Curated annotation (Swiss-Prot), chains A, B:
GO MF annotations in UniProt: metal ion binding; metalloendopeptidase activity
GO biological process: proteolysis
Similarity annotation: Belongs to the peptidase M16 family. UQCRC2/QCR2 subfamily.
Name of protein: Cytochrome b-c1 complex subunit 2, mitochondrial
UniProtKB/Swiss-Prot annotation, chains C, D:
Secretion signal span: none
Shown stretch of the complete protein: 46 to 78 of 274
Entry function: Component of the ubiquinol-cytochrome c oxidoreductase (cytochrome b-c1 complex, complex III, CIII). UQCRFS1 undergoes proteolytic processing once it is incorporated in the complex III dimer. One of the fragments, called subunit 9, corresponds to its mitochondrial targeting sequence (MTS). The proteolytic processing is necessary for the correct insertion of UQCRFS1 in the complex III dimer, but the persistence of UQCRFS1-derived fragments may prevent newly imported UQCRFS1 to be processed and assembled into complex III and is detrimental for the complex III structure and function.
Gene assigned in the entry: UQCRFS1
Protein name from the UniProt record: Cytochrome b-c1 complex subunit 9
Species classification: Eukaryota, Metazoa, Chordata, Craniata, Vertebrata
Subunit relationships: Component of the ubiquinol-cytochrome c oxidoreductase (cytochrome b-c1 complex, complex III, CIII). Subunit 9 corresponds to the mitochondrial targeting sequence (MTS) of Rieske protein UQCRFS1. It is retained after processing and incorporated inside complex III, where it remains bound to the complex and localizes between the 2 core subunits UQCRC1/QCR1 and UQCRC2/QCR2.
Amino acid sequence: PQDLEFTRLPNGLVIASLENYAPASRIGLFIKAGSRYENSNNLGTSHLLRLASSLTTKGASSFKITRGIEAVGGKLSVTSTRENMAYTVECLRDDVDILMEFLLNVTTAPEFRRWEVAALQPQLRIDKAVALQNPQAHVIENLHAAAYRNALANSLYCPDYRIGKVTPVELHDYVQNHFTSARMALIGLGVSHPVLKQVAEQFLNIRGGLGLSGAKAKYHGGEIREQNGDSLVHAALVAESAAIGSAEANAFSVLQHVLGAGPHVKRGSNATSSLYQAVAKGVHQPFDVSAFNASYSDSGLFGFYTISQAASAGDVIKAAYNQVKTIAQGNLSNPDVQAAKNKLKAGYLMSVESSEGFLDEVGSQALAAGSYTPPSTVLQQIDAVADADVINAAKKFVSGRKSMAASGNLGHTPFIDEL
Amino acid sequence: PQDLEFTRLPNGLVIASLENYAPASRIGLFIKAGSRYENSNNLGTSHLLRLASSLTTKGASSFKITRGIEAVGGKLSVTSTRENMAYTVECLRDDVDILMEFLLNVTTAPEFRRWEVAALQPQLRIDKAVALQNPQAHVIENLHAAAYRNALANSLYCPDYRIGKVTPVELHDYVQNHFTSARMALIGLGVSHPVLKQVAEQFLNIRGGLGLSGAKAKYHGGEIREQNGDSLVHAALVAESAAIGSAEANAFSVLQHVLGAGPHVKRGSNATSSLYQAVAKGVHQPFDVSAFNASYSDSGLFGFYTISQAASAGDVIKAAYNQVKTIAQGNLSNPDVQAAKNKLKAGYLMSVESSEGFLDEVGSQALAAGSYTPPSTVLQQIDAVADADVINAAKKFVSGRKSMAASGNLGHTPFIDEL
Amino acid sequence: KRSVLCRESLRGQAAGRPLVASVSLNVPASVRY
Amino acid sequence: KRSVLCRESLRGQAAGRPLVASVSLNVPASVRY
């Protein structure tokens, strides 16, 4: 009924709210601290911070905090990416107040006790371990660290050698410098904005400029290669995409989809996916491949991902490239761009068809722009992309510094010079 | 009294001998299997092979082997190179025969038993752990896998993921293909050549061509960076050296020494080392820098090595580069080349002033060339280097694809584009 | 570990605003795109 | 681990024939250049 309601304060923190109909409300304070905010000496402290969200803080002991949310059947999720760190908080309409006072403690009153922070430490390994089970995670990670040099090439997961060495002052300093007013965006899905503000005003007023971590962007072509014993091999090939919320970017997104192979059908094969077709024809029976597309504030990464077998690695890899070369040679007919488009549009909508989805989308936008762009407008922007534009962007991959990351038996994985 | 005595047989295995005066004799069969002979699927096999020298074999049980050499006070050492694998064997004049029959079983009659090989496995970890205690080893290893793509990029220690996965047919295969006649060179420091040959003829006649592992060389610039928590940072910067036993190479070696900083004085600082001087002046109080020079059959690696602290990494790293650029700009006076030379010459002679040294030198030469070049001749070659020549080589590092490896807090370590 | 032998593979990353978004929640936990 | 604070450590690799030669033996074991 009532649409969202943004409001930038004097501090510069953003806040939104949507009194929805249904029974479930969810706050989420998104602080601007991603993994790109750590240095050589600070690496792995966001990771630990992410995992220390239930520790004692100034008003609420670790015990109260967890038993408290249990009391009421809430959930407290602490999500992070290379650029941001969403602190989610779900619970029943009637219990938001009990819950909010928890989110506030957790975020503005953390008390990292030597003893408490010390117990955690080992959790990092356990966490890292489970996430590194998906080749995607280590390759994807390795990708970022090869393509960047300084900031976005920092991974999400603590470096093995740092684990036990993440000190209390480190956490306290990261909170202090990054968990600040200018970088924050409140976001409610079932709360009163009037009452939200009040609270935001009372609890979120802290000073801290950007880049006390060492903010800045830079792309650098590089290749990280991980040999294994596994039959299958994964590899990424990516060159500087266009930036976040910019036209070029958007273009990329649309091109992405022309090749992009995320199956829309269970047990179904893509007929739409060029990459898949092309790859497929020159490739063996079992394989899988998809267009990769990343966009961040101050740079992007666009290019594709492959999953071949030991002796097909190259064939696949090249095949994919060649095809994306085709579009950059100009060869791309109108029919396919419009399908792509509609694919993308559909996607975005579904992406925001959920509370959790919406709440992410909103916060996300808060941190980038400073307001909420409605869907419609969104939709218009994507449509504006020119059928040529797409090609043009694609031209850029082929004529853009390469950066690749592979895993598995790498006898048959092309190097930079190979392609 | 009698000088060595090489002899190539119909098989193509070399053999030498020097009846020395003194009490201690040392045989050593050098087989041409280095780490470079494994594939993605075979990595880590030489390593295990190296550690499995005392296992049961066809004519002597692990117990007899060990207890036997102990009986007489003998030592059995296997030397492994990225290119070669020296199997050393020391003992008393009188006991060579008991010992030799041991060396022959170990090398031509290995019996890798599922159970025996299996209990070893865990040793690999223990060995890897103890050699990874010196930054030099992990960096120096990281260097070779960055700078190469395929063959010499393989490391000497087994990859963590492979350890228990090293199977008995692997060991059996590796021996069979690589531990053959054409790739072997016997070498005695206190044995009769006449009697040596006989034995050689009786026990070292096995067939096996080269490259059933996948021989070939290739250089690829690349950077491997390993973040740590340690104050100190080590990094290596290296460009394709000249190949083994060729003029260019030799030139490199001389150049190496003009900058080369391996202290010749305890507690003493180099006055001679340009790198050190130049680095020093622009650098802090505590710092360590040394030139690096590697030469293999089908490629080399020349450049330097640095040990700086967190903030000084770049300053030192560039400093060192800049200085080596100087020599490449042409700036290098005669007086320093002759010093260098003499430094080198003195070193090579002291290198061979010991039994162990001599034995290595000799075998080494037998796998490269096919005969023993005497010292004198050696000495002549190094002298032939032109003062210019050196410069020219140097010109090649500055104008040759870069490849670096570092460890520690890398906030202040230049990337490829940094220098 | 889940075997990845057939045609089924359909994993590759690219979303609208979020890209490689890692969640750690008090209750659940995961890795998306 | 041995502290590498002062001007004393120069370690850098470059020999004549041998380069980065690793040796394993029962009596002994090591890493040279």
